[PDB]
Amino acid sequence: KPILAPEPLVMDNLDSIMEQLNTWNFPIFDLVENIGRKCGRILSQVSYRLFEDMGLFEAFKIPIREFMNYFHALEIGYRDIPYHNRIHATDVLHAVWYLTTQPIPGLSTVGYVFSKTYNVTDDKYGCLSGNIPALELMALYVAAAMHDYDHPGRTNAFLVATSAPQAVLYNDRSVLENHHAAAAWNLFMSRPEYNFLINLDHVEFKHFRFLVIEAILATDLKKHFDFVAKFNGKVNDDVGIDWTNENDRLLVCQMCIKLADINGPAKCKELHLQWTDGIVNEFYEQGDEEASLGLPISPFMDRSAPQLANLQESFISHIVGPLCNSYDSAGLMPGKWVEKIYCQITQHLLQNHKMWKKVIEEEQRLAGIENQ
Amino acid sequence: KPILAPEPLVMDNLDSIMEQLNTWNFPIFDLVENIGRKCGRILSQVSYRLFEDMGLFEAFKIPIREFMNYFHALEIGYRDIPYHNRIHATDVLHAVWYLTTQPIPGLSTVGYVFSKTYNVTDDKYGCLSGNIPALELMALYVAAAMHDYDHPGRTNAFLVATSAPQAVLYNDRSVLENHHAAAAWNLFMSRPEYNFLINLDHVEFKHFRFLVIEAILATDLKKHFDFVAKFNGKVNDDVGIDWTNENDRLLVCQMCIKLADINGPAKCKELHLQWTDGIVNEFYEQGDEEASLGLPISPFMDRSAPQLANLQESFISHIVGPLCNSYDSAGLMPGKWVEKIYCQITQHLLQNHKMWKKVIEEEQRLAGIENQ
Amino acid sequence: NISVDLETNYAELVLDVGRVTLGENSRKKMKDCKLRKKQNESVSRAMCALLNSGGGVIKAEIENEDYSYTKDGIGLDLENSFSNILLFVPEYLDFMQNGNYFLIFVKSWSLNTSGLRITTLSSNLYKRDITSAKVMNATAALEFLKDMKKTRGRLYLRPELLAKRPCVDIQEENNMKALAGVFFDRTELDRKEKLTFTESTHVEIKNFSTERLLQRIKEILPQYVSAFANTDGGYLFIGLNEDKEIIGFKAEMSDLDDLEREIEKSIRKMPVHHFCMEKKKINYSCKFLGVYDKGSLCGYVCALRVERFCCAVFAKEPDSWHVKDNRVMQLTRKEWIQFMVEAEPKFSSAYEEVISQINTSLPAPHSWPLLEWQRQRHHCPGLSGRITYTPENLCRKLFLQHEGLKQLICEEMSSVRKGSLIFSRSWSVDLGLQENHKVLCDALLISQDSPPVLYTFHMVQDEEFKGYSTQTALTLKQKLAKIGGYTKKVCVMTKIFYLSPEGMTSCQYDLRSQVIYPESYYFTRRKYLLKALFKALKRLKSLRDQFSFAENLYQIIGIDCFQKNDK
Amino acid sequence: NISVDLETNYAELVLDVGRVTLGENSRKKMKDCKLRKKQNESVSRAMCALLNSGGGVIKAEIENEDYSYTKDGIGLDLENSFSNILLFVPEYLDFMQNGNYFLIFVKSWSLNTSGLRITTLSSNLYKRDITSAKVMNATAALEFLKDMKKTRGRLYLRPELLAKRPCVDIQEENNMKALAGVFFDRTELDRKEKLTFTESTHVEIKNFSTERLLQRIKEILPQYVSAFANTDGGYLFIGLNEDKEIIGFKAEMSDLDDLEREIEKSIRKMPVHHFCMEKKKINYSCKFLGVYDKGSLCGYVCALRVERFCCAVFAKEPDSWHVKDNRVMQLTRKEWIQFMVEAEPKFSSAYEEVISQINTSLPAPHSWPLLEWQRQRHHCPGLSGRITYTPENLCRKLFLQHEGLKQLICEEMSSVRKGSLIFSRSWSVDLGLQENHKVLCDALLISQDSPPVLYTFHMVQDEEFKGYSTQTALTLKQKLAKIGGYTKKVCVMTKIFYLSPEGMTSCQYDLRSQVIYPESYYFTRRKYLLKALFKALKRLKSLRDQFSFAENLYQIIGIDCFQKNDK
Numbered sequence A, B: 001k002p003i004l005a006p007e008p009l010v011m012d013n014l015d016s017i018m019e020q021l022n023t024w025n026f027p028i029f030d031l032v033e034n035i036g037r038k039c040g041r042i043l044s045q046v047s048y049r050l051f052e053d054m055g056l057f058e059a060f061k062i063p064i065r066e067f068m069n070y071f072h073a074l075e076i077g078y079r080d081i082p083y084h085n086r087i088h089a090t091d092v093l094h095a096v097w098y099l100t101t102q103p104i105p106g107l108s109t110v111g112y113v114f115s116k117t118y119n120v121t122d123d124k125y126g127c128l129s130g131n132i133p134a135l136e137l138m139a140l141y142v143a144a145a146m147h148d149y150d151h152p153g154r155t156n157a158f159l160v161a162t163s164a165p166q167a168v169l170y171n172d173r174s175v176l177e178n179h180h181a182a183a184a185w186n187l188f189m190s191r192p193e194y195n196f197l198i199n200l201d202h203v204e205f206k207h208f209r210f211l212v213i214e215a216i217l218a219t220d221l222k223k224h225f226d227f228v229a230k231f232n233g234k235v236n237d238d239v240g241i242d243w244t245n246e247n248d249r250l251l252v253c254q255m256c257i258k259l260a261d262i263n264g265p266a267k268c269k270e271l272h273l274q275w276t277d278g279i280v281n282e283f284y285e286q287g288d289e290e291a292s293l294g295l296p297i298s299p300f301m302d303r304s305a306p307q308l309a310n311l312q313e314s315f316i317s318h319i320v321g322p323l324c325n326s327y328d329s330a331g332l333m334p335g336k337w338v339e340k341i342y343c344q345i346t347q348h349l350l351q352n353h354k355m356w357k358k359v360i361e362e363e364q365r366l367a368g369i370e371n372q
Numbered sequence C, D: 001n002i003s004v005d006l007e008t009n010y011a012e013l014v015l016d017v018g019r020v021t022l023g024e025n026s027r028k029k030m031k032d033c034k035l036r037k038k039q040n041e042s043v044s045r046a047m048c049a050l051l052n053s054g055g056g057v058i059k060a061e062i063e064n065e066d067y068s069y070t071k072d073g074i075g076l077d078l079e080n081s082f083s084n085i086l087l088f089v090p091e092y093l094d095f096m097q098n099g100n101y102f103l104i105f106v107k108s109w110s111l112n113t114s115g116l117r118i119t120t121l122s123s124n125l126y127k128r129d130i131t132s133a134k135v136m137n138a139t140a141a142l143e144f145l146k147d148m149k150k151t152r153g154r155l156y157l158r159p160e161l162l163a164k165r166p167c168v169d170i171q172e173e174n175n176m177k178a179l180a181g182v183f184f185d186r187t188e189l190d191r192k193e194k195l196t197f198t199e200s201t202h203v204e205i206k207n208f209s210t211e212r213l214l215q216r217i218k219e220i221l222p223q224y225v226s227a228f229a230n231t232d233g234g235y236l237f238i239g240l241n242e243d244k245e246i247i248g249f250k251a252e253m254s255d256l257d258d259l260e261r262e263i264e265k266s267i268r269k270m271p272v273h274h275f276c277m278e279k280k281k282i283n284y285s286c287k288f289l290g291v292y293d294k295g296s297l298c299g300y301v302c303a304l305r306v307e308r309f310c311c312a313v314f315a316k317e318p319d320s321w322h323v324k325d326n327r328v329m330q331l332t333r334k335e336w337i338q339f340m341v342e343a344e345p346k347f348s349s350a351y352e353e354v355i356s357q358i359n360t361s362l363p364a365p366h367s368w369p370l371l372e373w374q375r376q377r378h379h380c381p382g383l384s385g386r387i388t389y390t391p392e393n394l395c396r397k398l399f400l401q402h403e404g405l406k407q408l409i410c411e412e413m414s415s416v417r418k419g420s421l422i423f424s425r426s427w428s429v430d431l432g433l434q435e436n437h438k439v440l441c442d443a444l445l446i447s448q449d450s451p452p453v454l455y456t457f458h459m460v461q462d463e464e465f466k467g468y469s470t471q472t473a474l475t476l477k478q479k480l481a482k483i484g485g486y487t488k489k490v491c492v493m494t495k496i497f498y499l500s501p502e503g504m505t506s507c508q509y510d511l512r513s514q515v516i517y518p519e520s521y522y523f524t525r526r527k528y529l530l531k532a533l534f535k536a537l538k539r540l541k542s543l544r545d546q547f548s549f550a551e552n553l554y555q556i557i558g559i560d561c562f563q564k565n566d567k
Ligand SMILES: O=c1c2cnccc2cc2n1CCc1c-2[nH]c2ccccc12
Pocket: A155, A221, A262, A263, A264, A265, A272, A275, A276, A279, A311, A312, A315, C556, C557
């Protein structure tokens, strides 16, 4: 009756691509075309590979059968919408696994667990898997996996405006994020075979549940400026990020997932374009359903008069920009020294912004010419 | 099909007691014996009388029929448990109506609405109904009416410990308060005849809903010290309570309901004793159900080894004490000048605490004697 | 006296202090110490007044016929006064001789780590050191007043009990206080007898072998009374010598009464400020003792006792000035203590917090500043995207009609590496000032170099609007420095244009080629100016559309508003 | 030198400064100015050291044979030094003559509105006023260093452009700097020629008609170099007179080289502290010019130019002291700048925030204090509920066995209006100290009057434990004042008892009847002492069970823990 799993646990035909999984520009859609796109098993496979890489199946003694069971039920639960689907969850999972298990120049590593190779002998690069215990990292990974579960395909403001049942059930305060966390944990606790945390203590499980819910709720964009200002006031006027104080580590994981969630305009131009197509298509769907009700069509959600470049430029300038600047002023963005330090992510971000400002200026000028 | 109302709207036999409703030691249980205790219509009648006193039926043009409809559905919804029942809601409603519409020596009054008589000609007593607009006051009254709706009879910690469904649905963050607000507003929006806010604007309704949810969520005792410290840091180091800044008025209504919620040990000894019996009986019920599951029996919830005096003394010293001191240092507790100012509430609080410390010392000494 | 100079083409407050000698050798050689001290106190009043109220410039006419300032300096009393008011001088002052005048450009006093909010020439609150009565400086008076205001009064440990100590021959200040106390109740003094106590924190002794003794008392008594009333009280004896041999002053009856009455008035004229519920007065008691030599009275000795007070006691009003409208005035006692005691007010919501902390500028690019964003990225065709025409709806409206205006703005912003000009129907109203309707619009160009300009456009070929533009630039300077929290040297230049019916030229006024400033007034910062403008507009309750940061994205995301602080 | 006095029965740091004259007339009449200045600097070092490290007491032997202090005072240089370090003297010092010694009881330096964290005799950072080089005082140095640390360096506006100004004959300081610059590159000087510039913020001129000229330069040059390097740099010319007529010093070759080398060493020995990424050094350039009269060389003139620096430049190490373990030592440059620049650390969660702000005490009762709560309200049968035996589980355990202990505690707390004593297995370990196992327990009675006592119990009829109890009381005093934030005068008394096998008496030591304190050390406050104890235990990471506030109510309500700041 319950969704258990596919017959073979770990598939073999999707190899030679999972090994090139430590690159920021991961070819995710090539993998979706690699795995059978009919059923959908991308999130479960990527999760298994990443956990086996981190060795967390040993550091916590987790049974792989129930692990695959739970994550397959999860990925089946993700609605089939254009943007907030299982591919988005896999992307966020990979982005968090990258940001927390890759060399970060100017770090000070101190039952932790490091990535597979990591070639760590020097004293110039640290990884966040050395400053953060294994429990909190597994909590961050699981929270990133189940963070957009059962997404209806709308925004918080839409459900709040039309007074949807799910918006009254949560009193208009982080409607979607609370719904995701609640439904995911409910599905977890539903069956006895999904229980892949069987070898955890009681206090371990309670702290794990707390951290997972915190990470999931931290990805609400209404709290964006609060989180950004708190991170600024903790690495600007304070001593910085004390890797002993647990609130500091919690804030670090929260910001890490906040940035791994919106990472479209920080990859190559092709991946960024595809993610942009997805998000804007979902916006157009919402605009259709919102004109069907007689509500005034929201901004940027009109498939007759799109303003895609305006949307993406405003987004990159107002949300992803200051967030990357805050996350980088604390010296946490992964990079390398040059013979001074080359950060690929900020480079991709700047290039994409410049492309959008080309398109904006070109369209604006042409309209100004023709309109006279 | 829906609960509409009793046949006559406002009953007449419960008179000569509703007029003595401006006394802090209101004879609430005499009224419960006055009204038919079988069905239960105390909350609706008290609400009608208080609103008609404030004239809010005119200042907002509310139909009394749908008003009584909604509040009767509300009072029917209140579970029949020993403490968190419709009598408790009526008590909190009366306490808020007292704290916000009675003379407060040393106040500076500035579409407001005042109480029925209030005999206001002097410049020594202000009431909070002059510093707070009518909309926010009606929001506070309605929030106090529906604040313990559908109470299961347990604590937040109990539902969180046994992982009840209602605790997973809200992610262990203000489980009971979110449940109350959500179920009450859901019942309101359910039928078209409950809509007693028909003559409100759209932005008026949105702000009203916001304020009501805020007031309801403010009565969670896990936020007690946060609210107390915030009120201390706003009337100790600041200019005080700027009655223009809306966040100040919001904090004032939140603290007013926080204190009107727990007002047992601030009335006469008889009312205080009755409320104490109710609360401790509910605790004993929870202890029965929690020993039935094999969980360790919580403190103070053992009907075989009660520690009632310890509970009530610790409560009065740790929760109600500092809250009254904070609410009084801002000069908001209603009192009178003496020929310097006599506050009945703090007097009742001190007397009840001294009684409990008599009982504590007596029992402690006798046990120390016999035990040898 | 000191009077605002209304006939100068500076966009600033220009105080006129009259004639003043200069040069160190000539200030020294000046054969009149009274006039020298008068000139010094006048210049210092002007400087304090300009520090307390925005910026300014002090203008003094060179009195001596021959002055150079490249071979004469300024002086040594003037430098002492300057260094006394200010911590770091070259950060606040700039000196410039312009022909027959000596100008001093004064920055505005800015909140620093010390916590001071104003500058005072002298607090006039005296404190009692171990033996000497000294006046509290700025930080001493600050801590004293803040401590007294914290407790709603001043704590004492009134004689409820003497501490039960061991038995030992110990000597302390309480011995001197008690001996002076028994001296105070003594009834007659043997002329030429020795004292058993000396002067301490409760006992001061004065000789005053003067024939008058009235003017000396009237001029010196308030500072000792304020010293005692501010630390533990004590006794003041007048009539001894420096060797403690009782001598007394040779005065006769019917003079003792007038002298006591003069003491009474001289103490009752002393100010006082209570933080306590009740309002007492300076409790003391005068008394006169005879100094009988053998059987005769060799004179008298005046004994005065002051009790410890509940709050502050000034010897005079505090020396703190400011130019209110014109005719620079001294701060009142209530206003002075309000500036000293009460905190700085600020809310700083998280949105504005990030919009401000976008100004880190560590050793790296740190792109994406949120204050210079604009949606319409296409104005002024031949150019790149480097001038944010801010309001975006007033600018387009103003450019549609008024055909010469767009071409004028393009001609004007050509030589600007990066700036952002902000239009308005009238900046005077936005800065809380009287408006005049003849002005079409205004503007405010804030570039990297080239201090902020204030373009004033109009179509009337009759008037000048020099007064309007100068008043607006003045108030903008003062608002920036005081309310906006800009902590450097600023000067708002000006320009006036004439837009006729198809005439887009005739700049009727160019303030840059009329007035000369020091070298450091020309290099502003263009980002702290934007933050200062944001904060000044917010505190003025007129931050409406400038600094666009469009909200079609926020309204979708769900983020709220960011200003109009009543919600 | 200065050495800790290890053989005094005070529970404090007692510094011994040797012999010291006293009395104002005798300090004046002392016919040796060098010894007087040496004594003064010694006392001031001791006082600064005691201020920086908890409290203390300065002990000096009265040098002159006849001293009274009730008819001689202290002095006038000593009072000047005291008033220079401290803002308000009677708040920090108390003087007491005990036979053949003069004691000074020094409170601990407490954080005030100024923002200072330590006291320094002299920062040794010189700043350049308009014409004179003055040393920065405490608040000037504080603001200077905080400003430099904020920008990770010190900003300049390097000559990218000269401001395009109008044309006018204007005179400014840049004229004097440029003229001195052309003077610096001049190749030969006519003896007895006039200068066209005077001294300003970039130009200092010195005569020095000395035969040696090496010691004078070596002792005066670092302060001018530090003045210039801290504000805009400048030139220093040596060889002129007060009338600007070039004279030069009469020196011959083979002396110029040694003099230049001495200048080089005297500049390279000057400290410096960088907040910037790179670490440059003091860039300057010496040069010697001839003063040819007619065809002969009448001497030489030394021209020295110092460039503006990126960060601080001291003339010597900062005069700031503290007693580390013994043998009072001077603060190091890194530690000094760390105390000055870095903030005060504090978290102050909301629970602890309310547990502290329960100490309002406005003019009203304000009942329900949360720090003196206890569940077991029944100890010591004949009494009321007015002594909170705090730990409640160590106290009951200790009272069950050790039969004499409960009766002893009852005998002891009889004469106490209201207090709260706090037991422990060993207070020495709780205060971060070496333990000794022979001690049974301890205690800490904190009443209204009667300053805090430290009962030390033990059952060994061989030893004394005076050293143990005195060290523990000393460290408790210092911890309270420094970490707990108690801002008044405290003294931790002591008592030692002997609990034999059924012997509950024989107090082997009672510190109150052994040492005499000033009158104000006996009246503590009992609520700020409790807050101070809370904060000190928290910062020491040993706040476990003291201050009960039982949590059977919180665990039901759901409120969390309140301490162990790692969660
Ligand atoms: O342009 C992008 C984008 C571009 N590449 C990748 C991801 C992206 C995600 C988002 N947007 C802008 C709109 C939006 C996005 N996440 C939201 C969440 C809530 C409400 C609105 C939004």
